[PDB]
């Protein structure tokens, strides 16, 4: 029965599933940007993106199910950014926070691999539970990045339906047979997630404030990454009826709502643990 | 008539029209992928990326117009590879190269601003002459990246046509006034370059393989980033009829046929100097 260092990582649909079960359905950006920064106080450079990041893995890494930084917070210092988020990935990590890494990424062949290789293989510096994608260059184009999430046990979320103003113009276009891109990409989700229990490894990200939700089909037994909540119509009593059935799959991600309460870690920790209950309370209504 | 380290960059379309005229139309990439690292007789590390990336440029610095880094073989050794990659675009552009970060990024907001933070204003340690973004999210998510670009006299590159398999999946995808995904990007462009002369600062990804280029306006009086060159029907001589009278817009992008030379610097050169000289020959024949 012995243990060792090559063990695979249980699928992370499995292991999600599981984070929300016990610490709660919530995931919390870890979003440093010059105004959370200015707002706890600090400056607008790596030493306040350093203090922000590690007090928030502090107060919340063990109580959290999932962070969520966002990589273009940390790029804008170059590669001493990239080094606080490394850090604050492992941190995370090894408190027993799931992390997804907000990365939007999207190329083609060797240079997707090569991005996988950066997020979703477990001897990278950047190694993360799951890593946003976008699809612009077709879903087949993932590929590389589907098979090593899978291998390392893994999961991807890919962009389909975001709430932004102008979100619609790519994602609402029709294909010739009649699926719009974002169906088009709910689609290949629940193929590539065929079967998988209690929930497959590659889901959508899918903003909890859109209106036209019900015109889709979100039932992708995949986890639905869902930014925004806090906002108008999306708060955790909100989550039931703008999702449906699939809310019971979804990772609401919370940023302001919960970051805003820094540096002070028993707010941060109280907010964290509010929001928590107040969608789990939602879910099991 | 005095100078001031605040004088601003020239716009990017002219800068590259005459770095095209000056030093011959090739951009060259940056690809340190495992595979070419090997070709090399160097090692799949950050030694190795790094020996790489220094003799690219020392070789070709001072000659070629255009260099196109893929940020993702550096980010594959994290904050490192980060590191290494900065330093590459600080010598290539030292050395006269125009650098066009070829990183796919596309997010909203104060995310993209934050992008547009990394790679486009001229104090941050990623510096680019312009940036590949993906418009997943819609045109207008990338404004904060446009205006910063056109403060900065640095151009964006957004993704339009690709030729990988499934590059029509989005991009062929009708919006209601009968434009597909690919025509509408480019038509934003047309709109963000009208009137600059001699050539706008915000091109399009076009890939020089791809066969119903006839179909498209390419006319949109910005340059258009072709990969792909030295492949199959994408030989110099072929860039003619593949563009039409937009041919004189393409920044014609080759990396293996370049880079398999290396890491001999005389070979390295004499590729360079070959593409630019018979893509040079065939756009004035």
Same mark, same amino acid.
């Given at each position: 029965?012995?243990?060792?260092?090559?063990?695979?990582?249980?699928?992370?649909?499995?292991?999600?599933?599981?984070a929300m079960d016990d610490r709660g359905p919530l995931?919390?950006?870890? #979003?440093?940007?010059?105004?959370l920064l200015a707002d706890w106080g600090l400056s #607008?450079?790596?030493?306040?993106?350093?203090? %922000?990041?590690?007090?928030? +893995?502090?107060?919340?890494?063990?109580?959290? &199910?999932?962070?969520?930084?966002?990589?273009?917070?940390?790029?804008?210092?170059?590669?001493?950014? +990239?080094?606080? $988020?490394?850090? *604050? =990935? &492992?941190?995370?990590?090894?408190?027993?926070?799931? =992390?997804?890494?907000?990365?939007?990424?999207? #190329?083609?062949?060797?240079?997707?691999?090569?991005?996988?290789?950066? @997020?979703?293989?477990?001897?990278?510096?950047?190694?993360?539970?799951?890593?946003?994608?976008?699809?612009? $260059?077709?879903?087949? !184009?993932?590929?590389?990045?589907?098979?090593?999430?899978?291998?390392?046990?893994?999961?991807? %979320?890919?962009?389909?339906? *975001?709430?932004?103003?102008?979100?619609?113009?790519?994602?609402?276009?029709?294909?010739?047979?009649?699926?719009?891109?974002?169906? *088009?990409?709910?689609?290949?989700?629940?193929?590539?997630?065929?079967?998988?229990?209690?929930?497959?490894? @590659?889901?959508? +990200?899918?903003?909890?404030? $859109?209106? #036209?939700? !019900?015109?889709?089909?979100?039932?992708?037994?995949?986890?639905?990454?869902?930014?925004?909540?806090?906002?108008?119509?999306?708060?955790?009593?909100? $989550?039931?009826?703008? %999702?449906?059935?699939?809310?019971?799959?979804? +990772?609401?991600? =919370?940023?302001?709502?919960?970051?805003?309460?820094?540096?002070?870690?028993?707010?941060?920790?109280?907010? &964290?643990?509010?929001?928590?209950?107040?969608?789990?309370?939602? =879910?099991?209504?």
């Amino acid at each position: 029965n012995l243990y060792f260092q090559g063990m695979s990582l249980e699928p992370f649909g499995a292991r999600l599933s599981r984070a929300m079960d016990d610490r709660g359905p919530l995931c919390v950006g870890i #979003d440093p940007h010059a105004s959370l920064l200015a707002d706890w106080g600090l400056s #607008d450079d790596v030493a306040g993106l350093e203090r %922000f990041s590690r007090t928030v +893995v502090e107060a919340l890494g063990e109580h959290v &199910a999932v962070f969520k930084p966002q990589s273009a917070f940390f790029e804008r210092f170059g590669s001493r950014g +990239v080094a606080v $988020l490394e850090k *604050t =990935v &492992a941190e995370a990590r090894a408190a027993g926070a799931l =992390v997804v890494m907000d990365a939007k990424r999207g #190329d083609i062949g060797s240079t997707m691999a090569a991005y996988a290789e950066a @997020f979703l293989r477990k001897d990278s510096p950047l190694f993360s539970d799951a890593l946003t994608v976008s699809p612009y $260059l077709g879903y087949g !184009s993932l590929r590389p990045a589907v098979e090593l999430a899978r291998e390392s046990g893994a999961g991807l %979320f890919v962009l389909a339906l *975001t709430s932004n103003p102008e979100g619609g113009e790519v994602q609402h276009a029709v294909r010739t047979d009649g699926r719009d891109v974002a169906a *088009t990409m709910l689609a290949h989700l629940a193929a590539e997630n065929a079967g998988e229990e209690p929930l497959g490894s @590659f889901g959508a +990200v899918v903003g909890a404030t $859109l209106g #036209d939700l !019900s015109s889709y089909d979100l039932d992708i037994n995949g986890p639905l990454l869902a930014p925004g909540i806090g906002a108008q119509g999306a708060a955790p009593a909100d $989550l039931p009826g703008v %999702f449906g059935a699939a809310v019971r799959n979804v +990772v609401p991600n =919370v940023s302001r709502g919960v970051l805003r309460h820094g540096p002070d870690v028993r707010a941060l920790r109280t907010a &964290a643990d509010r929001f928590a209950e107040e969608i789990r309370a939602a =879910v099991a209504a």
